[PDB]
Design a protein around this ligand. Structure first.
Ligand SMILES: *[C@@H]1O[C@H](CO)[C@@H](O[C@H]2O[C@H](CO)[C@@H](O[C@H]3O[C@H](CO[C@H]4O[C@H](CO)[C@@H](O)[C@H](O)[C@@H]4O)[C@@H](O)[C@H](O[C@@H]4O[C@H](CO)[C@@H](O)[C@H](O)[C@@H]4O)[C@@H]3O)[C@H](O)[C@H]2NC(C)=O)[C@H](O)[C@H]1NC(C)=O
Ligand SMILES: *[C@@H]1O[C@H](CO)[C@@H](O[C@H]2O[C@H](CO)[C@@H](O[C@H]3O[C@H](CO[C@H]4O[C@H](CO)[C@@H](O)[C@H](O)[C@@H]4O)[C@@H](O)[C@H](O[C@@H]4O[C@H](CO)[C@@H](O)[C@H](O)[C@@H]4O)[C@@H]3O)[C@H](O)[C@H]2NC(C)=O)[C@H](O)[C@H]1NC(C)=O
Ligand SMILES: *[C@@H]1O[C@H](CO)[C@@H](O[C@H]2O[C@H](CO)[C@@H](O[C@H]3O[C@H](CO[C@H]4O[C@H](CO)[C@@H](O)[C@H](O)[C@@H]4O)[C@@H](O)[C@H](O[C@@H]4O[C@H](CO)[C@@H](O)[C@H](O)[C@@H]4O)[C@@H]3O)[C@H](O)[C@H]2NC(C)=O)[C@H](O)[C@H]1NC(C)=O
Ligand SMILES: CC(=O)N[C@@H]1[C@@H](O)[C@H](O[C@@H]2O[C@H](CO)[C@H](O)[C@H](O[C@]3(C(=O)O)C[C@H](O)[C@@H](NC(C)=O)[C@H]([C@H](O)[C@H](O)CO)O3)[C@H]2O)[C@@H](CO)O[C@H]1O
Ligand SMILES: CC(=O)N[C@@H]1[C@@H](O)[C@H](O[C@@H]2O[C@H](CO)[C@H](O)[C@H](O[C@]3(C(=O)O)C[C@H](O)[C@@H](NC(C)=O)[C@H]([C@H](O)[C@H](O)CO)O3)[C@H]2O)[C@@H](CO)O[C@H]1O
Ligand SMILES: CC(=O)N[C@@H]1[C@@H](O)[C@H](O[C@@H]2O[C@H](CO)[C@H](O)[C@H](O[C@]3(C(=O)O)C[C@H](O)[C@@H](NC(C)=O)[C@H]([C@H](O)[C@H](O)CO)O3)[C@H]2O)[C@@H](CO)O[C@H]1O
Ligand SMILES: *[C@H]1O[C@H](CO)[C@@H](O[C@@H]2O[C@H](CO)[C@@H](O[C@@H]3O[C@H](CO)[C@@H](O)[C@H](O)[C@@H]3O)[C@H](O)[C@H]2NC(C)=O)[C@H](O)[C@H]1NC(C)=O
Ligand SMILES: *[C@H]1O[C@H](CO)[C@@H](O[C@@H]2O[C@H](CO)[C@@H](O[C@@H]3O[C@H](CO)[C@@H](O)[C@H](O)[C@@H]3O)[C@H](O)[C@H]2NC(C)=O)[C@H](O)[C@H]1NC(C)=O
Ligand SMILES: *[C@H]1O[C@H](CO)[C@@H](O[C@@H]2O[C@H](CO)[C@@H](O[C@@H]3O[C@H](CO)[C@@H](O)[C@H](O)[C@@H]3O)[C@H](O)[C@H]2NC(C)=O)[C@H](O)[C@H]1NC(C)=O
Ligand SMILES: *[C@@H]1O[C@H](CO)[C@@H](O[C@@H]2O[C@H](CO)[C@@H](O)[C@H](O)[C@H]2NC(C)=O)[C@H](O)[C@H]1NC(C)=O
Ligand SMILES: *[C@@H]1O[C@H](CO)[C@@H](O[C@@H]2O[C@H](CO)[C@@H](O)[C@H](O)[C@H]2NC(C)=O)[C@H](O)[C@H]1NC(C)=O
Ligand SMILES: *[C@@H]1O[C@H](CO)[C@@H](O)[C@H](O)[C@H]1NC(C)=O
Ligand SMILES: *[C@@H]1O[C@H](CO)[C@@H](O)[C@H](O)[C@H]1NC(C)=O
Ligand SMILES: *[C@@H]1O[C@H](CO)[C@@H](O)[C@H](O)[C@H]1NC(C)=O
Ligand SMILES: *[C@@H]1O[C@H](CO)[C@@H](O)[C@H](O)[C@H]1NC(C)=O
Ligand SMILES: *[C@@H]1O[C@H](CO)[C@@H](O)[C@H](O)[C@H]1NC(C)=O
Ligand SMILES: *[C@@H]1O[C@H](CO)[C@@H](O)[C@H](O)[C@H]1NC(C)=O
Lengths: 321, 162, 321, 162, 162, 321
């Protein structure tokens, strides 16, 4: 008669690594790395993302005429921009401190567009001929919808003195611009006055822009340039414009109604008609694992990203052949 | 393994022991069979479960990357941003993979230790009333029926009785 | 007769954590995390900090009239500034490259204020009417004490050509400014000349400022602005000013006598009449522990900061019930 | 524990042994008492003391945060600065907490090992001149007075003499 | 060591055993000599070799510094750059030195364990046909010639034969 | 008769450290830290580095007359610049966005210098008197060889309108400059026109420079300054210059023929007539170790840098006295 001491074995083929030995077969193990995603852009926690499609953030905010889809967008969870959107600045130029603005958007979930300087209140200037073939719409020449490209009326451009007071409770994103013409002839042709400026003031801002003339290569058929600027106008503060010519005046500006968690996600994927708790630029994640290896830039309640191909913990013991 | 039992002096595991990680196999005139040692098995479950949660929990607070965009004349800071994000990823990847390797080694050794301690526990009861065969088994000098066998698993094997 | 092998037990209730088991009672243990501080701002190694109180670094350096307490400050160990000091720029405006200057101060323990351009050496300009109601002192209108706000004398502002040569052995911090007026009338009212400038040159510096006019919101009762600039004038170099109007001239400048370990600590606490070897924004530390969890920003000989609530090492063995 | 002695085959510690971590308890006609094993106790003190200093020393060089201020249009680099400082804090917090957990496990196991080795050391001297009771104790076949007991603690128990 | 064999109950190593890490020394009327245990020696070589490669390999992906230059009014970002490069160096220095200390302790203990398991393996064969001297040696009751000795190293020592 | 179990010993004095014990003698060990270097700057993988010697990157690229050694340099593996090269900007001034350009060079292995605006095509302006005593060559006054300092011819400086079209397949680095004179007299003396500008345009660039006059300290015998600018001209784009005076015109510009792995290494060492696979600022490395402690900034296939003085792994076991 005998009694023996021994231990469990089973049909497991699960393997784990240790420092001294790789591919040790064990009776039980626990994978802790999520390796799969659904391959789609999805609603975060019910709240749909802003999918800019072929538009950029600039094209959206300035109101590029090819971006009418986003003329009034509801609140978003996150934003999705392509690596190289085709509908950026239709009329060539620059967006000043663009990257700092996009960073500002990572803390914003909802804008409310409102009118601050009506297009039909420019009685001393022509305000309906501020268009170009570089910004087409339905076959006709158009322009960034949110700003007014003002020109001379009956061969005069008198000084503009316009002020807007932020009586709203919410911070306000104000956009405007300056036009750089091809040469001296174009300057007088549009604005009459040969030497001009745009002065902009708030409680913090003290700006004075002057147009830089230069012979420039054509970009979308234009030698001229548009340089766009912005500020955040705080509650009870007023913005003050004075100009001599070359002024691209604000028409619409965005109220910042909701601030919170957001992100601009760079991706070529489109909307997935889909819902998730954790989103990445190449698809959504749905698992209880503590780790994943899909992509470092995620939003939501996510596992921690690691670069591993494999993380498996031993729970049971060494299995017998 | 470090403790010499698993795949050591006990050559292999038992497909036949389904109800626990460690246990006993008995063999006498009445029959034979397996019985799991509940106490040491549950000890192992608790230690390994706590470990897994400890591992997960320690990796709870960890670097999260954020999107930052830079223009064409901000290449230096763009590169700094890139090196920083990547640097932390590599550090946390390293931490994760090393923790798994190290703790996997300790988990296998832990099981080996629990088998060794169970074996010794029985050895210290039986003393010289049985032959230590050298393969995990003890051959009795007296006849050991199922009640006898049960007292070995109990911890109450009455050595003065035999 | 018998002999037994055994191990120590005692009345200890100290507990430590391990990977597999939490709250293991042990016979002996060693805490290695300092959790307490004295709640006070203290002298570092005998050397008292500069406590700016309600003043900012700008208010201090420019000589805001409400900051006479710091008109001549002895050498410091570290500096303490509130999160939102009320006595910053009394007259509204900007301090150019302010953050880069504050960074410079982290390597400075002592300034020596000296006079470079005497206030009573401006014979061709009025130099004692450069005041404003935004910078009050004892009920009267005053101004930043370290710079001179020059205006026209008998309806003329002749060109200024003034040069200072750094004959001191020590690097010199020189401050100056430009005034931005409300409109064209204010410009001529103060400076006569309608179009003005300030040109500043050293061996490295090549500056030319021009005043930007714009309609601005009132801040402390002023539509005008003051923009302040600085440089480090190296030994044997000379600074050269030329101006047409709008010049805020240096009166006093700071010798940098001692360079070394310092820091600008952000805190709402006041002086503690107290001494320590290791200081934090919420109190001083006095322990021999290798770690602490008070605050990441410390100065002195300190333990390493960690975010833990508890670090306790086992020294003894598992204790018996 | 891994080595089976502490809270294993030796059920509990001794409040009565004040002068060391490990030792002996004897019992004969002359009386009974405790005596610390000096050598193995001092071994334990040295190992644990070196360990604590090794831990402290390794965490000597470590990230120190510095104050950097940024303006309203330097938000990207401010955020980079923030993520960098925080990132390193989390890395060092992790290192510190993990080192403590891991080494605490090894310290408890180290003590268990020292008790086991002391027990075996005595077992190998006595051989078959005593009954291994299974609880840490050895019951002698011959009468073992205080000089006899002392030779067991010595290492000089003359087995051929008994 | 944790396992009690190396510099424990086996006081010292053998200059005379050249062909392996662990083995046997025999002594009878025909003569005496050393013989390496091939299996357990090769086990040790494989474990330590894998370990060294595992260590090297884990430290493969690691922070690489890059030169970035800044001007006189970019002091803040220069300092950030400096603190970032240094921070990662300190983290990787720490990882490297700690891994070496920790794994060196485990390597020494691993060898100790392999000696202990070899010793027990022999002990479990011989059983009560030899006196356990307590110093690593077994003194036979019967005469054990070279074929006899060889069967102990084999694993095929026929206990019923003696 | 007896059989004994035992373990290896030998004459080793190698020692390793553990957590609980330092300086444990072991039978075998493996050093994993490379501690030695050859003390020399060497060819990387056969490909020689660009050793700028006493010249800086600016002196090289602008063509400082003391840097004729580097007038046409073959492709390099890495670049070596001293901490404080003496031949930088011979005529005092600034190199705009210099650090961003040096960063650009870390991704460049080879330039091909070509002529875009011939020196002898300036028929309306004097183009062979643009020299200074601050940039000497063989006892005579010279100037940065790659750009042309143009002045008035027969007391007139007519407007310049020059355009270059990048018909090359490769990106092009274009350099130019503006001259800042001492005072109003020097301006007319060189350029006639009292108020001048330089306008530069590409598809992306929209620049207009104006000279800043100011009284400046002498540096290398000059009160005037030269401010140098650059751009990358993409294929099929054109650069357009228009100027009134003060223009330092491009003569030569660099084709970017090979892009790849490079670095600017700061070192006082000279060429070693030598070859390596891994280079550092204080010498080359040749080992199979996984780690080294020579220097953090390396180039090539290198071991990982650590700050340790010692890394030694135990392989064998504890050795006996
Ligand atoms: C953009 O447009 C805004 C309004 O459309 C304008 O806001 C401000 O306008 C005037 C500025 O003079 C203020 O008028 C008066 O309001 C004060 C009321 O104080 C507080 O209490 C009442 C209680 O019911 C609140 O409503 C109110 O919000 C406020 O918190 C009043 O005290 C003060 O008059 C004073 O009278 C005293 C003697 O009785 C004098 O000593 C003292 O000197 C003063 O004359 C003041 O004049 C508005 O209150 C204010 N609007 C607000 C706060 O909402 C912005 O200024 C404008 N922005 C720019 C840049 O111009
Ligand atoms: C700010 O103000 C500073 C003085 O108040 C001024 O400093 C410089 O001023 C002049 C510049 O011309 C120099 O004068 C002469 O000093 C040279 C002495 O050389 C060295 O040896 C003496 C030994 O006793 C030292 O004191 C001295 O510090 C120095 O290290 C002298 O060699 C030289 O004259 C030469 O004569 C030679 C023929 O004998 C000629 O070949 C040669 O061309 C030259 O004429 C020189 O002229 C001061 O020495 C100097 N002060 C110093 C260094 O302290 C700053 O220049 C001024 N800053 C500005 C921007 O204007
Ligand atoms: C710098 O200098 C460059 C040349 O020295 C100049 O490049 C461009 O110059 C003109 C711009 O008008 C282009 O001329 C024509 O080329 C088009 C050919 O298309 C493609 O196919 C041919 C096939 O053999 C390729 O060689 C060629 O590379 C190209 O990929 C042609 O289609 C087009 O004419 C068109 O005719 C159509 C009716 O037939 C019209 O509908 C249409 O409107 C258009 O008139 C075009 O005019 C050169 O091709 C082009 N050079 C290139 C691409 O290499 C740069 O523009 C100049 N830079 C600046 C800033 O000025
Ligand atoms: C290269 C060549 O053979 N000829 C160009 C010639 O085409 C060019 O004229 C401009 O051409 C572009 C298209 O390439 C547009 O047609 C310009 O017209 C418009 C425009 O559509 O943008 C008309 C519009 O009504 C104008 N709007 C306003 C508010 O003024 C604008 C505007 O004036 C300019 O965009 C401002 O820069 O222009 C047309 O002018 C000329 C450049 O003038 O150069 C020849 O060499
Ligand atoms: C809104 C309204 O009803 N009226 C304002 C009117 O108050 C304002 O005048 C200015 O008011 C401020 C206080 O709000 C000061 O009183 C200005 O006077 C001083 C000043 O104290 O700052 C007097 C001082 O002597 C002047 N010093 C010098 C060196 O010139 C300064 C100085 O000129 C200005 O600060 C420069 O910007 O002003 C007083 O001018 C006017 C704005 O002029 O606007 C009405 O709408
Ligand atoms: C301090 C004193 O006693 N006298 C200086 C006087 O020397 C100085 O004149 C300038 O002196 C420098 C050397 O210090 C040069 O000699 C200047 O001449 C040149 C030059 O070599 O650089 C001649 C050259 O032909 C000129 N080239 C062109 C293209 O114009 C240049 C050029 O005009 C200037 O560099 C432009 O800034 O100058 C010589 O002018 C005068 C400053 O003019 O000041 C006295 O106080
Ligand atoms: C572990 O096992 C031992 C041995 O099996 C247990 O002792 C045995 O316990 C059983 C059940 O309690 C006893 O059965 C009794 O039999 C008598 C008749 O003889 C009857 O009157 C009772 O009602 C009961 O059925 C049995 O006598 C007893 N045998 C021996 C040899 O001890 C022991 O209780 C167990 N201990 C533990 C801690 O589990
Ligand atoms: C450890 O303990 C053993 C046993 O106690 C020691 O042996 C004993 O040592 C004592 C003290 O040295 C001896 O006492 C002697 O007694 C004689 C008279 O018999 C006297 O003449 C001497 O002056 C001395 O007092 C004792 O004889 C001896 N007994 C035995 C059985 O060995 C041993 O020395 C100790 N060894 C170590 C390493 O500590
Ligand atoms: C390990 O060692 C044992 C004992 O040394 C081995 O058994 C012995 O094996 C040898 C060689 O195979 C046998 O030798 C034979 O002798 C007979 C004459 O008696 C001869 O006819 C054969 O040609 C051969 O030379 C020997 O009899 C045998 N002795 C004993 C006691 O078993 C065993 O084979 C080895 N096992 C392993 C796994 O290495
Ligand atoms: C180990 O003991 C700690 C220390 O008491 C326990 O911490 C307490 O946990 C309870 C329940 O979560 C809290 O309400 C108390 O605030 C904690 N007290 C302290 C002093 O921290 C902890 O629960 C125990 N951990 C485990 C795993 O059993
Ligand atoms: C372990 O050995 C090292 C190596 O010799 C010792 O290092 C020496 O320490 C002394 C005293 O501090 C120094 O003066 C020498 O410069 C060191 N020599 C070398 C080669 O580094 C060290 O002291 C020993 N460590 C311990 C803890 O005993
Ligand atoms: C392995 O055994 C399990 C019993 O736990 C059984 O369910 C499963 O079918 C088996 N798998 C294979 C491949 O035989
Ligand atoms: C995620 O997948 C699991 C399958 O394991 C499923 O239970 C759960 O419903 C899924 N959740 C969503 C939102 O798709
Ligand atoms: C525990 O025992 C120690 C003896 O070391 C004694 O000083 C202390 O008073 C005791 N504590 C309690 C609470 O009984
Ligand atoms: C710090 O506190 C300790 C008490 O543990 C005391 O010995 C020491 O004097 C204190 N030092 C100072 C500067 O307060
Ligand atoms: C140590 O022993 C080795 C044999 O492996 C021998 O080659 C060497 O000469 C010896 N070294 C010394 C210093 O005796
Ligand atoms: C590097 O040094 C080793 C000596 O260990 C030698 O074999 C090899 O040829 C050397 N390589 C070079 C390029 O110097």
């Amino acid at each position: 008669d005998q009694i023996c001491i021994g231990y469990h074995a089973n049909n497991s083929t699960e393997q784990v690594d240790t420092i001294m030995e790789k591919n040790v077969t064990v009776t039980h193990a626990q994978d802790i790395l999520e390796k799969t995603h659904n391959g789609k852009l999805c609603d975060l926690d019910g709240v749909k993302p802003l999918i800019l499609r072929d538009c950029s953030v600039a094209g959206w905010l300035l109101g590029n005429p090819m971006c009418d889809e986003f003329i009034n967008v509801p609140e978003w969870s996150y934003i999705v921009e392509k690596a190289n959107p085709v509908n950026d600045l239709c009329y060539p130029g620059d967006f000043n401190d663009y990257e700092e603005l996009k960073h500002l958007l990572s803390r914003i979930n909802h804008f409310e567009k409102i009118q601050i300087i009506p297009k039909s209140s420019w009685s001393s200037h022509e305000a309906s001929l501020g268009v170009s073939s570089a910004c087409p719409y339905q076959g006709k020449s158009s322009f960034f919808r949110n700003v007014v490209w003002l020109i001379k009326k009956n061969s005069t451009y008198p000084t503009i003195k316009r002020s807007y007071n932020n009586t709203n409770q919410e911070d306000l994103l104000v956009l405007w611009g300056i036009h750089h013409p091809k040469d001296a002839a174009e300057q007088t042709k549009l604005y009459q006055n040969p030497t001009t400026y745009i002065s902009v003031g708030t409680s913090t801002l003290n700006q004075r822009l002057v147009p830089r003339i230069a012979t420039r290569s054509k970009v979308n058929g234009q030698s001229g340039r548009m340089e766009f600027f912005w500020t955040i106008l705080k509650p009870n503060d007023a913005i003050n414009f004075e100009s001599n010519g070359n002024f691209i005046a604000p028409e619409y500006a965005y109220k910042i109604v909701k601030k919170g968690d957001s992100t601009i996600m760079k991706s070529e994927l489109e909307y997935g008609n889909c819902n998730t708790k954790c989103q990445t630029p190449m698809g959504a994640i749905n698992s209880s694992m503590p780790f994943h290896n899909i992509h470092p830039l995620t939003i939501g309640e996510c596992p921690k990203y690691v670069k591993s191909n494999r993380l498996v913990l031993a729970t049971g013991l060494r299995n017998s052949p | 393994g470090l403790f010499g039992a698993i795949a050591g002096f006990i050559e292999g595991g038992w497909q036949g022991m389904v109800d626990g990680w460690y246990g006993y196999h008995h063999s006498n005139e009445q029959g034979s069979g397996y019985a799991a040692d509940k106490e040491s098995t549950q000890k192992a479950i608790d230690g390994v479960t706590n470990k897994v949660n400890s591992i997960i929990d320690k990796m709870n607070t960890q670097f999260e990357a954020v999107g930052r965009e830079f223009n064409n004349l901000e290449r230096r800071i763009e590169n700094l941003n890139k090196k920083m994000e990547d640097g932390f990823l590599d550090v946390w990847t390293y931490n994760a993979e090393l923790l798994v390797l190290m703790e996997n080694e300790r988990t296998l050794d832990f099981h080996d230790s629990n088998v060794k301690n169970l074996y010794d526990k029985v050895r210290l009861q039986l003393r010289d009333n049985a032959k230590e065969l050298g393969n995990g088994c003890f051959e009795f000098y007296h006849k050991c029926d199922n009640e006898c066998m049960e007292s070995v698993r109990n911890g109450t094997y009455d050595y003065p009785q035999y």
